[PDB]
């Protein structure tokens, strides 16, 4: 709860904003509106695009690529809001930018933002 202090990751609770995989999340944790860490809630639509970040995992000391994907087609969840920005770059480097609504590829052309999932898609580097 010091906002300007270096972000301290934890691996014990996925609903809180300091969970290690949320290091560059912008919005809401889908685990808090009926999805899960890596799945969308019912009635929403899973985008295919993603911004990515290398998030340090305090547990095994390894860095993993989290490819954030949005669940779209609902109004914002309003539960478990978080904005982190580890390694986050301005819009002109979109692959690393998180103000952008990554709902591209979602079924039914869904582009409204409900929440975001935090899957590992790789090792850093």
């Amino acid at each position: 709860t010091d906002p300007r202090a270096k972000w301290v990751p934890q691996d014990n609770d996925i609903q809180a904003c300091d969970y290690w995989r949320h290091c560059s999340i912008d919005g809401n944790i889908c685990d808090c509106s009926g999805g899960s860490l890596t799945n969308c809630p019912p009635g929403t639509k899973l985008a295919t695009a993603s911004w990515v970040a290398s998030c340090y995992n305090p547990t095994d000391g390894q860095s993993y690529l989290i490819a954030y994907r949005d669940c779209c087609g609902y109004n914002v969840s309003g539960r478990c809001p978080c904005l982190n920005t580890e390694g986050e770059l301005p819009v002109y480097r979109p692959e690393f930018a998180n103000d952008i609504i990554w709902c591209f590829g979602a079924e039914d052309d869904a582009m409204t933002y409900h929440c975001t999932i935090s899957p590992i898609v790789g090792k850093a580097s």
């Binding site: 295919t48 490819a67 692959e95 591209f104 590829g105 590992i120 898609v121 580097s125």
Partner: protein, 354 residues
């Protein structure tokens, strides 16, 4: 033991005695100096290969044998997607069931039957020794056991270190031994965040231990017919390649037009591209994906021809959900993907990149 089995398969692999007129071995089409693909120039360029008879051409591009050992045995998964197997249509379950079929294919090596193979095996004293040492005395006198044993040896050979060394630049960067260049890291970032990774990565999520840049699935990406290859194959221009639907026992019409996702390892040196070798250049292969995403005029045009791609050979079961990403790759991103894919070249073929 397994050493000897594969050592036997290493002999068979380069032996033209397994072709009717003895003009070709597995290595003739799967040239080790070319990442186990065919260097030769036929009627349709390098799009399709020429059999033992000097004239017959196939209808499909010869694929690399690198990393083919990592592919699981053909099966249907719990989500009802077919996965794994061998050949572009998965018609062979695994490497063992695949190995016999070039020997007997008349448009390829063109042996008349298992007996003619056994007969040719039995003419070599080294095979009599090597085979009887692993499978028992007389095994070459039974055509069925002999053919099966040769298929085993070849499958064992294809599963050695040599075909799957994991010594690409990509592998060295994942072990922390070097770093991507800026362009290469941009391409890798783009590869895992664009739609590529929905098909060309082993797992949906997590990290794979031995990544081969394919999820082993079957997809119709809407490719046109390759006109000169189809003509050289002589299968008739009324012919339709139905892909996985051609595997005996697959019946579900939703599988027509779908092919196995190729591993992208060595892709930079195994041109031309796709199941029918339609695109000579890697960058053209990348650009084909823009036809589903980009507004621009030039996205309809195959840069190799200066003409529209062509209608899909099979205009249904297109993987639209994956392909209609809503985002077009600009030149800088196509550039960067080319660089990243170049880093999947095994060490020993780095000299081929030019």
């Amino acid at each position: 033991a397994d050493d000897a089995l594969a050592a036997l398969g290493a002999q068979l692999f380069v032996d033209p005695a397994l072709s009717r007129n003895a003009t070709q071995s597995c290595a003739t089409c799967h040239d080790p100096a070319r990442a186990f693909t065919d260097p030769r120039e036929g009627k349709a360029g390098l799009a399709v290969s020429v059999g033992d008879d000097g004239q017959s051409h196939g209808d499909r591009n010869t694929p690399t044998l690198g990393y083919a050992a990592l592919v699981p045995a053909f099966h249907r998964d719990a989500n009802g997607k077919y996965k794994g197997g061998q050949f572009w249509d998965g018609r062979a379950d695994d490497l063992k069931q695949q190995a016999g079929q070039p020997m007997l294919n008349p448009v390829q090596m063109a042996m008349p039957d298992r007996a003619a193979v056994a007969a040719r095996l039995r003419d070599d004293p080294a095979y009599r020794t090597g085979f009887e040492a692993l499978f028992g005395k007389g095994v070459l006198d039974d055509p069925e056991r002999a053919f099966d044993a040769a298929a085993e040896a070849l499958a064992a050979y294809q599963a050695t270190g040599e075909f799957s060394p994991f010594d690409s630049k990509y592998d060295r960067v994942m072990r922390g031994e070097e770093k991507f260049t800026p362009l290469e890291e941009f391409g890798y970032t783009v590869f895992i965040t664009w739609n590529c990774r929905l098909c060309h990565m082993q797992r949906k999520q997590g990290v794979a231990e031995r990544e081969t840049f394919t999820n082993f699935e079957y997809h119709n990406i809407g490719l046109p017919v390759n006109e000169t290859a189809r003509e050289a194959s002589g299968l008739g221009a009324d012919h339709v390649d139905h892909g996985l639907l051609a595997r005996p026992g697959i019946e579900d019409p939703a599988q027509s037009g779908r092919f196995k996702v190729p591993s992208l390892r060595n892709v930079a040196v195994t041109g031309p591209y796709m199941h029918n070798g339609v695109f000579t250049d890697l960058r053209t292969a990348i650009l084909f994906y823009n036809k589903y995403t980009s507004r621009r005029p030039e996205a309809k045009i195959n840069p190799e021809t200066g003409a529209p791609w062509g209608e899909p050979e099979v205009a249904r079961n297109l993987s639209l959900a994956e392909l209609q990403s809503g985002l077009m790759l600009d030149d800088g991103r196509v550039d960067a993907l080319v660089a990243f894919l170049e880093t999947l070249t095994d060490r020993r073929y780095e000299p081929l990149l030019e």
